[PDB]
Amino acid sequence: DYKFWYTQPVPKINDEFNESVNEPFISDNKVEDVRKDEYKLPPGYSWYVCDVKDEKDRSEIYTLLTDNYVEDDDNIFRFNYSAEFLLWALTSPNYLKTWHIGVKYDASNKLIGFISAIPTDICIHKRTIKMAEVNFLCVHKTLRSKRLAPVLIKEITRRINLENIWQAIYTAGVYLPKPVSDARYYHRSINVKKLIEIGFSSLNSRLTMSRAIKLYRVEDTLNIKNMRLMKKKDVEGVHKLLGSYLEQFNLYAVFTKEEIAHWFLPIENVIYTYVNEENGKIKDMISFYSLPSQILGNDKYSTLNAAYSFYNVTTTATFKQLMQDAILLAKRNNFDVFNALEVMQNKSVFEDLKFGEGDGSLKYYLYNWKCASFAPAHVGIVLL
Template sequence: MFWNGQTVMQAHEEIDEHTNEEIFPLDVSKISQTPTKLPDGMEWCVIDPEDEDAVSAVHRFLAENYVEDNEGNFRFRYSYGFIRWVFGQPGAEKEWLVGIKSGGAIVGFISGFPVRVSVREKEVCMAEVDFLCLDRSMRKKGIAPLLIREMGRRVNAKGCGQAVYTVGGRITRPFTAARYYHRQISIRKLLSVGFSVLPRGSTVEEYEKMNRICVDGAGVFRRTTKADVKTIKSLLDETKDRWEVRRVFSEEEIEYVFCSDGGVVSLVSEDKDTFISFYTVSTVAIKENTEILCGYIYYYAAKRKADLLGAVRSVLSLCQEMGVDVLNCLDGMENGVFIGELGFVPGDGMLHYYLFNWKLGYTPSEKVFLSLL
């Protein structure tokens, strides 16, 4: 198995809960400058985030081949604008947007972005790895390990020795895991495509009434602007002690991610004590060829945990205005404050969090402040 030979926590390892250390020190001088060998007829390519045609090609490739549920009923479909926004993050390394071409067409892709992660007070430079995807014709042919190995080589060559990534399934030993929860908004649409199931003994009208969005108790929030960068930075700093593992944002990153017209919608309270963000991604019901617009709660910070309830009420109200069909979250971070109160229901999916070249004792998901796109 590919992962057995990698510098990751192995499933069979006995790891003390207090463990927090690098597995293998990085020596950049020993990193190969030669790209990983590919089968005949394939070649590596780099996606230039400024090249609209190249980004469009990746967008089409992901739309046709990216994550599906186990039954093959639903597939993620990121918008072109969202993909381009993700690729343009501050500090992004063009060489970490890696594709494989065959016959001039993209048949494989993986991306990485440099981030800073505080792991129990140790701040570590990591690559946030995402969008691993293969054309259907290339699956189960040993191509995915080549993409992962090449990404690792490129990341290491830049002096970065660690990576963080998430997977729906369990592949090695995760340092935490969380379950997806869903707050249904467009009940009839979700029922019609099989995303939701009508509870036994309920009518559609009763189920709609049960899931009506109530704005009572919502805080007074507005969209963020660039003037809110320092407020958000202050809120993140004030709440950092709540987390054992957390993403560390610079002011430049905060401005790009939370205070610009990009892929994330961010709100700040009138008293500037709370901020919250979410993003939207379409999920295609494949058989019905119907798009479901899904919202995902992203990062937030509240001086008082109880204020999250009003913040998420405001997000739900805005989602309804935007035509979002369902708002999703995980049962990690401080989401337990609002999940039950606001009608989120457990889904079938789990998300497992992994670290490359770092050994960490299991950490409860409510102590992990990481949200990968």
């Protein structure tokens, strides 16, 4: 079908471009020609600009997502982003409040739809372009398949265009026209009994309960003994270490110093970053963020508390040793499982460190940009 997406500046499902192509579908755009009127909504619905710095507006978004956002392929789990997490993810440097858009049902004054974007500098095939990073598209379950999502997309495109920005980046679990890369996800069990009780991990005659507990047990000693929580004094060094690491990839964000402080300085129950400092220099770093999933229907446990691999760089140890420490630090902060995508160098440690393959993949997309696609080991960016 793709009745909507084939009207947009994106590749068709069979399009394929070679390395000589790296440019927009539509160039020479003028801000003056962008529509000045908001898109029409059905009778009884209105646009609403959300202020995520206000606790009440932030809680309205939280409630919408907790009840209606992404579920796994089998409808066992639903993401449960915390309200503090949403604050962090949506207030990066130079964010625009008018790019946090909602749709209200006027008769009850309830939020039933949402989409957001934040500005970012993206390097694709060595070209750096100012882009919007789009996320948290959600329509209330009672209003699905009514073609409301295309309206949310067109309205946010209009508002991004009004700022003279014409490219975007986004990720989704569903296959749309057309991914630039596609990355399976993997899991590493930490709380073995909990994962068994909820029916996610499986046992058999070879892998009994006691053997599984033994298999996934980790030693409580760090390979990099001076790993410690990142502080404001570490921003400059993390900026240099991560910047140098990311330049090898075909797709990655170009961070400013201010952006490094926002995305990595630790926040309890949201973002964790550890560093190894030697001779005044940051030589190694580990980071992971907190994203629990609701266990739908379970009356014993509210959530599975997962840590998600963010950005990890090592110069004094092997990558296997570094990610072994990452798992231990997640365990020390009481996380139940450590999740990761097959981007950057992550695939090289999955077998040895006893990760298990998931049942789906995350696709990476660009809007109004045509280029060759690439394997996910060349992806160097993680969206939230």
